[PDB]
Enzyme design. Structure first.
Site: not given
Ligand SMILES: CNC(=O)[C@H](Cc1c[nH]c2ccccc12)NC(=O)[C@@H](CC(=O)NO)CC(C)C
Ligand SMILES: [Zn+2]
Length: 491
Positions: A401-402, A405, A443, A450
């Site tokens: 997930h990071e 980004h 989320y 996100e």
């Protein structure tokens, strides 16, 4: 026997106990029982508008508050009564005024880095004064006659070490039993442990509270400093190391626990191991990713009681990352991070106490603690070991997930290298988010960035069904992300 052991230790420390000043005794009580914020003060400070605001807010809805923070705010609401951007902003500032004064928690949250600017200056300085005072109180070691005649005991909630394994530790079918698969995963890379705060331990083993399924048995060193506390306890000096000797299932009154046998060792011995591991993993990955010699990408910021697992799991996480994402993507984006002195930070202290975050986020109300974070200003990924991502199966998914980004960042960079924005701030993606943003995880609804990161994570799941789900339920998003990956890889 129990009471002979208690008598001997109390007597060993009797001169110390009798020599304590009233301030010394007061500080030790302060340590044992944190000071809660007063609801009266908070409410009187609030204006009519904010009271009106707080009255309506659904506190449970907040994703960035702890259960305990939610309870306190719930009680505030109760005293006043008798989802939006504006509401989130108000709670982020209010969250500041509701922190208990808790010396041991400050030490654990910071890993002893108590100058970290993650709490208000006044309280930050008082913590420092109190810690220096307690350090000076604890001058007397357990000694050569007692250290190998006594064990000390600590009950512990597994969520303190790993909330990810804590979710499944107790047999879902049977309260009384431990899940042995989860047990084995817990034990696998658990070889050493650090205490950055003051351990409060029992001279004689006590029954665990319901949420405590770990039962530590600890052998002190003859040189370990400590103080006697009422009711058969010791407070240990902070900054000690522990080597894990044995981890086994035990049964007490028909109920299963995990016994952890540990031995106190110099903290420096463990810190050296962590530093050696950090160099080794950088050397491995510099070679794998074709990074320049001496590149420092990976950082271990490790200070707490599941220390060795932070280190060992970093290897596993990066392996899963490399195994599930296209190599050219990983190389180009990671080189971009390195060009801005970026880091992959694996840590067991809270994320506001990580310089890669707080150096670029002066305001505490803007600082975030979470399972993970990407900080564009430092081109860094932070991953917090002990917490569990709410919609994640494992820590590797959080890292991916990071990394999503970082992909968003580099894709945006390539579009306009001289003024570098995120591609999730483009018109095309904003429209896609507003259309499809509720179609994946809960989320992922939070905002454009996100949603991208969550879609990216799911698109690189080990579960091919999850990749399919993104293509079916968010087809524009699926296409957009694949377009960005192709764009980066063909650069
Ligand atoms: C620990 N529990 C969680 O899963 C928290 C909960 C949360 C939701 N919104 C927030 C705002 C501020 C602080 C915490 C939260 N969320 C996260 O850790 C996610 C934070 C994130 O998006 N990092 O890039 C990363 C995750 C998907 C791996
Ligand atoms: Zn995120």
């Amino acid at each position: 026997s129990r009471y002979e052991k208690w008598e001997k230790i109390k007597q060993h420390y009797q001169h110390w106990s009798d020599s304590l000043s009233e301030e010394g005794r007061g500080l030790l009580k302060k340590l044992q029982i944190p000071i809660e914020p007063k609801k009266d003060d908070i409410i009187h400070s609030l204006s009519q508008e904010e009271k009106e605001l707080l009255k309506r807010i659904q506190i449970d809805s907040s994703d960035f508050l702890s259960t305990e923070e939610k309870e306190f705010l719930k009680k505030l609401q109760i005293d006043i009564r008798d989802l939006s951007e504006k509401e989130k902003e108000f709670l982020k500032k209010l969250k500041l005024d509701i922190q208990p004064y808790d010396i041991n928690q400050r030490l654990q949250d910071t890993g002893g880095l108590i100058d970290s600017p993650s709490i208000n200056l006044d309280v930050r300085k008082q913590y420092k004064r109190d810690i220096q005072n307690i350090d000076a109180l604890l001058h007397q070691s357990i000694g050569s006659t007692l250290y190998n005649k006594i064990y000390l005991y600590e009950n512990m909630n597994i969520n303190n070490l790993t909330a990810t394994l804590g979710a499944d530790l107790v047999d879902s079918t049977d309260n009384t039993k431990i899940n042995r698969g989860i047990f084995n995963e817990f034990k696998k890379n658990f070889k050493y442990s650090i205490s950055s705060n003051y351990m409060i331990v029992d001279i004689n083993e006590r029954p665990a509270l319901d949420n405590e399924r770990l039962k530590w048995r600890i052998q002190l060193s003859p040189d370990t400093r400590a103080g006697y506390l009422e009711n058969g306890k010791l407070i240990l000096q902070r900054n000690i190391g522990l080597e894990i000797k044995d981890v086994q299932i035990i049964k007490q009154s028909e109920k299963e626990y995990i016994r952890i046998d540990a031995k106190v060792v110099p903290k420096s011995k463990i810190d050296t191991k962590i530093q050696e591991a950090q160099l080794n993993i950088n050397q491995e990955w510099n070679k794998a990713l074709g990074l320049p010699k001496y590149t420092k990408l990976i950082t271990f910021n490790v200070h707490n009681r599941y220390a060795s697992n932070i280190v060992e799991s970093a290897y596993l996480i990066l392996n899963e990352w490399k195994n599930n994402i296209q190599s050219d993507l990983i190389k180009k984006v990671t080189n971009y991070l390195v060009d801005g002195n970026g880091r992959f930070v694996f840590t067991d202290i809270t994320l506001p106490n990580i310089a890669e975050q707080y150096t670029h986020q002066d305001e505490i109300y803007e600082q975030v603690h979470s399972k993970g974070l990407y900080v564009p200003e430092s081109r860094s990924i932070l991953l917090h070991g002990p917490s569990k991502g709410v919609e994640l199966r494992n820590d590797s998914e959080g890292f991916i997930h990071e990394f999503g980004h970082a992909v968003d960042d580099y894709a945006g960079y390539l579009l306009d290298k001289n003024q570098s924005d995120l591609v999730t701030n483009s018109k095309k993606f904003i429209d896609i988010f507003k259309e499809e943003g509720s179609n994946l995880t809960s989320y992922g609804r939070t905002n454009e960035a996100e949603f991208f990161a969550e879609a990216f994570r799911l698109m690189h799941s080990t579960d091919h069904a999850e990749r399919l789900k993104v293509q079916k339920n968010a087809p524009k998003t699926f296409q957009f992300i694949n377009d960005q990956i192709k764009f980066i890889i063909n650069s």
